[PDB]
Design a protein around this ligand. Structure first.
Ligand code: IM5
Ligand code: IM5
Ligand code: IM5
Lengths: 286, 288, 287
């Protein structure tokens, strides 16, 4: 049917946050599974648990803390979600994407979406960072789009375009800068496909997603990106390739959450250095 | 707990009987007008207008580019009823509301449903302003559960497991093609597969390429549910798309799909749509 | 919050009710597909429960599906058989569709055998073929329709279960090698089952999509049960009866239809019973 939040609910939450912190973020960063350590490098950090914040969705997941952290990252005013919400948990997409519109109302102009993802492109290795050039929204094709229902004109248009969702200039700048990281592995770029989960893919399903032209797969991110673009936010995205999706019947290996968290923790230092360089490539407001 | 149709058989019947007792018109053909195609009701003679708000059990709309009215009349001498303004899944309607009027038309005594829409071109040979005959569809929402027949089957309308391989009437499409060839028009009448996606946001480049790889020639957010319900209750079905824009299929382009361009393409093709709908009426069999 | 309406206690109450109303203690659960209800005929010492008798069990009406649970022995192996499954197209949410699978787990079943009728997408399949399910494509699952959606119950399984090993490798190898004993002209087929919601049959363009995706057979069931089975640690074996060849060209005047599907089931019933008999012998014992 429809979004349960009114415009006033988003506004009340934003105003509450603005009156309880001196921080005025330009960039919002959503931290994915095992990527919560990205909040460690924030200076002058102020923490809000989701339970404190009016209208915020309330449950957990292990690997995802449940807190909003305001601070400076490489001198840039940021707000960071440590713990995102997923459709597989039972949330409708208008709950999943609620914070994105809150960030818009806080005065954020840029959303950085991060996630763990399974590698579908065979040239990707575990520990690679893949810039999200584009996505395939499989749930969206069937009806599961966060904009379903009446459009709120105060956020955006009825029929927003998504062909330019992942900012071209930021990706070019992130690629050219990656020279400064001094890494053996080059920065990957490709298409993220969203599937609902929560179960991992079969071999046949992996091959479907490969045939469709997806380079990495996950269960998040796309709804947030749609809502961000709907309200005019610049969007940058990247995936940590935490595992190679099983694509043959001979293998005895199986995708599993423990391996996903481990890959996150092993890459944590490299992710923090990359997000630092990323802040320098973000245009200022106005 | 059980996901089912909220309308009873009696609700459809009450709406049909209400319409039949408030107009002298007895339509054979129902025509659903797509986005920017509402001007197709202008050529109706002896027109009688009902706003959807007047009609019992009818859904109440909310889209700009879609008026919200049922128009009875004669189109090229043929008794028609026309929907100016359809309902979409992206608006929040369940598919049993979206397709409600199709069963009403069946109960009015309509034997043919003409479905029209605006669509994005996926086939690179299509140009803006082309008319594509719908030979077939790909029902992506249907694969996942979003089918208008979900829930208990009403035997009074049709079977539990209706076939869709013959949904778009073969004879009407052949007649439309042969009649077009006789006109000696330079630009050909196109024919292809329509893929339904829910929307309401437009496709990414990667998504466009998915739909191309799947063998779709045009994409939109409607039509397929109506066609399924029509075929379920035995209606003959004819479909066509106005190609209102070419879907963005590369990352170099600065162009973006947008509603304003879609409406504009509709208005620009008005003359060509009227000539096409004229030939179309001639290709529809009379009742027994 | 979109969640399972059953608590752990509901599953447990249903299992305990069944355990206290039959002396049978099944090791293997078998779900009978459309026109495959005759698989319950070879059960010895049979005890029948109608679904209406059983607490918390879903209730309602499809033709070709009886609506009963049958406990008994099949080739000397303790079985429980569903004659009549539930489908998403009927209006049931997937947590109702898959409810019996968790009940079987709590009865002490360690193996689920899933059977179905399916449309042939692979052109080498003929009507009457048995296709071993090596793998599946869960199209509804991609979009959100997964029976595990909502809070995970740790007492059944993990939050993020793997499905790449869903169809037991050893049982498929044993079923293939044994099929020699059946003495059939047609070899045992093996392939990928794609689930679509239905209830309407595929268009030609849709058939070609499913072929391009690498599916060998198509149906409207089975996959949700398999996911819930694997979530709670059950060994899973699956097969499809190819009841019709899906229409893949516009020249054909033939149309898929339920009557032809039921007829194909009844014609293959004897062969299915002999195959399920050999299948029970290839299932490992408990502990
Ligand atoms: N679908 C999918 N998602 C993921 C993810 C991303 N998320 C990580 C977490 C499971 O560990 C879920 O929220 C999905 C990592 N690897 C994979 C994979 O192989 N497949
Ligand atoms: N999905 C999709 N639909 C359309 C349509 C059809 N409708 C037109 C209207 C948005 O302008 C929606 O109801 C969809 C035209 N062009 C396109 C396109 O490029 N994509
Ligand atoms: N989708 C699909 N399903 C089936 C089935 C399996 N079920 C059989 C029954 C309709 O006859 C539905 O429950 C689906 C047999 N043939 C086909 C087919 O061609 N297509």
């Amino acid at each position: 049917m429809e979004n349960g939040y009114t415009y006033e609910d988003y506004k009340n939450t934003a105003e509450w946050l603005l009156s309880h912190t001196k921080h005025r973020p330009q960039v919002a960063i959503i931290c994915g599974s095992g990527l919560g350590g990205l909040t460690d490098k924030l200076t002058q950090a102020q923490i809000f648990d989701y339970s404190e914040i009016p209208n915020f969705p309330r449950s957990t997941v292990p690997g995802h803390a449940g807190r909003l952290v305001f601070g400076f990252l490489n001198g840039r005013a940021c707000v960071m979600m440590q713990g995102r919400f997923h459709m597989y948990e039972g949330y409708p997409l208008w709950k999943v994407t609620f914070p994105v519109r809150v960030f818009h109302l806080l005065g954020v102009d840029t959303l950085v979406v991060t996630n763990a993802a399974g590698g579908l492109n065979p040239k990707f290795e575990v520990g690679d960072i893949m810039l999200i050039r584009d996505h395939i929204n499989l749930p969206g094709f069937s009806g599961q789009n966060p904009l379903r229902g009446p459009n709120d004109e105060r956020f955006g248009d009825r029929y927003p375009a998504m062909s330019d969702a992942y900012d071209r200039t930021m990706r070019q700048r992130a690629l050219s800068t990656w020279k400064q990281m001094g890494e053996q592995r080059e920065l990957q770029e490709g298409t993220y496909v969203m599937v609902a989960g929560p179960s991992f893919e079969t071999v046949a399903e992996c091959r479907v997603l490969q045939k469709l032209g997806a380079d990495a797969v996950g269960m998040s991110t796309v709804p947030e990106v749609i809502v961000a673009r709907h309200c005019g936010l610049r969007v940058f995205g990247f995936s940590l390739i935490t595992n190679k999706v099983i694509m043959d019947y001979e293998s005895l290996e199986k995708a599993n959450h423990e391996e996903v968290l481990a890959a996150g923790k092993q890459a944590a230092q490299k992710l923090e250095q990359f997000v630092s360089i990323l802040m320098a490539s973000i245009p200022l407001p106005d």
